[PDB]
Amino acid sequence: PQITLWQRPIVTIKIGGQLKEALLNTGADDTVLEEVNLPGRWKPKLIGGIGGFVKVRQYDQVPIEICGHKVIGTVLVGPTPTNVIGRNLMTQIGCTLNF
Amino acid sequence: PQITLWQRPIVTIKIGGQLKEALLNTGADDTVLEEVNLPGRWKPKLIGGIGGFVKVRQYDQVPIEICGHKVIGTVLVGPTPTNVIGRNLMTQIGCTLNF
Amino acid sequence: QVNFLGK
Numbered sequence: 287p288q289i290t291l292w293q294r295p296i297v298t299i300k301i302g303g304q305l306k307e308a309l310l311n312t313g314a315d316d317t318v319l320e321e322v323n324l325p326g327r328w329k330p331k332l333i334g335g336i337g338g339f340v341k342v343r344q345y346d347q348v349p350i351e352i353c354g355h356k357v358i359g360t361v362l363v364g365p366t367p368t369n370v371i372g373r374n375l376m377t378q379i380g381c382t383l384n385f
Numbered sequence: 386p387q388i389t390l391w392q393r394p395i396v397t398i399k400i401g402g403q404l405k406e407a408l409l410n411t412g413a414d415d416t417v418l419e420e421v422n423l424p425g426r427w428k429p430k431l432i433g434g435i436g437g438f439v440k441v442r443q444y445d446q447v448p449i450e451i452c453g454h455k456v457i458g459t460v461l462v463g464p465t466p467t468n469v470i471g472r473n474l475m476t477q478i479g480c481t482l483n484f
Numbered sequence: 485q486v487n488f489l490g491k
Binding site: 291292314315368377380 | 479
């Protein structure tokens with residue numbers, strides 16, 4: 287786990303053989319990570335839309351471990367001010383908002 | 386409630402005598418709402434930081450009801466692509482991430 | 485912070 291929100295909900299992830307940190311972001315539809323070298327197929331994707339668009343590489347069905355939970359989901363790889371775990375992967379780990 | 390994340394976590398809020406909808410956004414430090422007239426004191430605040438800054442009005446200790454929970458917190462008022470409930474108010478309502 | 489994605 288239960289994570290309070292007094293601080294930014296940053297968690298450890300394992301992806302592409304690397305240990306990283308990322309923000310659990312319920313405001314983000316998608317997961318965007320930088321500085322990861324993923325194997326297998328990708329396609330370009332345009333995201334954002336403020337000031338222009340940002341182009342990222344979309345990798346589907348990527349195995350990823352998020353705070354101990356091994357799941358699978360789409361990961362967008364490209365520049366991002368902060369590594370972000372979006373709703374697409376929070377659903378996979380069974381993460382809910384509770385109050 | 387327990388809110389799953391397959392869809393955007395949009396909730397009803399009551400603010401400044403108006404009913405509105407806003408996104409529960411654990412990636413946002415602050416709460417930003419558009420098209421609300423709040424009474425009482427404010428100061429300008431610069432937020433964002435990509436492409437420049439956005440100036441908003443900071444109102445402190447604003448009463449707000451979020452999905453039935455009457456709380457108090459800082460509300461930033463300014464045009465925002467989407468109304469956002471940030472961590473500052475999610476803490477007030479006792480909202481946690483759980484998995 | 486103001487973190488997002490839509491997209």
